[PDB]
Amino acid sequence: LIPPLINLLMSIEPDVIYAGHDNTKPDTSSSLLTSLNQLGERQLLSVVKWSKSLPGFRNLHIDDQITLIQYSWMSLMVFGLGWRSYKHVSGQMLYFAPDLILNEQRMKESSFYSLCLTMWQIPQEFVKLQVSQEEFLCMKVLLLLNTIPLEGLRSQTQFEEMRSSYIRELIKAIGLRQKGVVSSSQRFYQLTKLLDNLHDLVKQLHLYCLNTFIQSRALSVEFPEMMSEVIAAQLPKILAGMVKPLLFHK
Numbered sequence: 336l337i338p339p340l341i342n343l344l345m346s347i348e349p350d351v352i353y354a355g356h357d358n359t360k361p362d363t364s365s366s367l368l369t370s371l372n373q374l375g376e377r378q379l380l381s382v383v384k385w386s387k388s389l390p391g392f393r394n395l396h397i398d399d400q401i402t403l404i405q406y407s408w409m410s411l412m413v414f415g416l417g418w419r420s421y422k423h424v425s426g427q428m429l430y431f432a433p434d435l436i437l438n439e440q441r442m443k444e445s446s447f448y449s450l451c452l453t454m455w456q457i458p459q460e461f462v463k464l465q466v467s468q469e470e471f472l473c474m475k476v477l478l479l480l481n482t483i484p485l486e487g488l489r490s491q492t493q494f495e496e497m498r499s500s501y502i503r504e505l506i507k508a509i510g511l512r513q514k515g516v517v518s519s520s521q522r523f524y525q526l527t528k529l530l531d532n533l534h535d536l537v538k539q540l541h542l543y544c545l546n547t548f549i550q551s552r553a554l555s556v557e558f559p560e561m562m563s564e565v566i567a568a569q570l571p572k573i574l575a576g577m578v579k580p581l582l583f584h585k
């Protein structure tokens with residue numbers, strides 16, 4: 336059977352979110368970026384709601400909660416994207432939403448082809464490692480907890496306890512399918528290494544995002560209120576390396 340905390344995590348996963356994109360009109364650079372931002376605003380709102388039901392999280396100081404959402408949002412959404420593309424279209428298309436799915440041909444014509452390719456690494460890797468939903472749900476929580484300020488958080492003790500709690504839960508998640516100490520131990524390394532590597536992938540998306548933000552009026556891309564808030568609140572500090580990424584390995 337499934338360990339209780341893992342079962343809870345599945346019950347609090349967000350519902351399907353639509354882009355609201357008008358697919359009865361040809362893709363333009365403007366229209367895609369507008370749709371992706373509208374969709375992202377909605378996904379981040381659902382991440383915030385999610386976090387209010389995530390055990391441990393509401394007991395961190397409110398300022399730590401805000402900071403962790405502001406540090407981790409891009410990671411959470413690209414990781415979510417990865418999981419949907421894996422589960423719904425065998426990882427061979429980018430499943431942003433049910434009404435916004437890019438096959439490779441549509442990616443090629445997007446104007447951010449290589450960004451699509453960067454993002455496409457995750458679901459291909461999911462296919463490769465055959466990640467289970469139980470492993471995914473634990474890893475996703477660890478991403479939320481994967482960077483802290485250089486001075487630490489106000490609720491550092493509680494945070495350490497929460498992060499350790501979810502690391503122990505991933506170790507239980509691995510034990511469900513994988514049998515053998517050797518196999519389980521190596522799988523713990525693989526999954527935690529994947530999380531480590533996401534720091535580098537996310538940095539590329541952060542730089543693309545901030546560049547597009549700066550040039551938004553010339554490019555005619557709308558940046559929503561919360562999106563603009565999180566960008567202005569932490570993105571340059573993050574890109575500058577003025578935060579502490581938490582690595583599982585050397």
Ligand SMILES: COC[C@]1(OC)CC[C@H]2[C@@H]3CCC4=CC(=O)CCC4=C3[C@@H](c3ccc(/C=N/O)cc3)C[C@@]21C
Pocket residue numbers: 371372373374375376377378379380412413416430431432447450540543544545547548559561562563
């Ligand atoms: C071409 O991309 C434009 C982006 O750069 C503009 C660069 C990376 C995009 C995010 C990639 C992950 C992602 C997954 C989704 O399923 C939908 C949203 C999404 C991205 C987009 C995004 C928009 C808004 C928000 C939060 N708003 O509150 C989050 C993500 C756009 C960027 C950042």
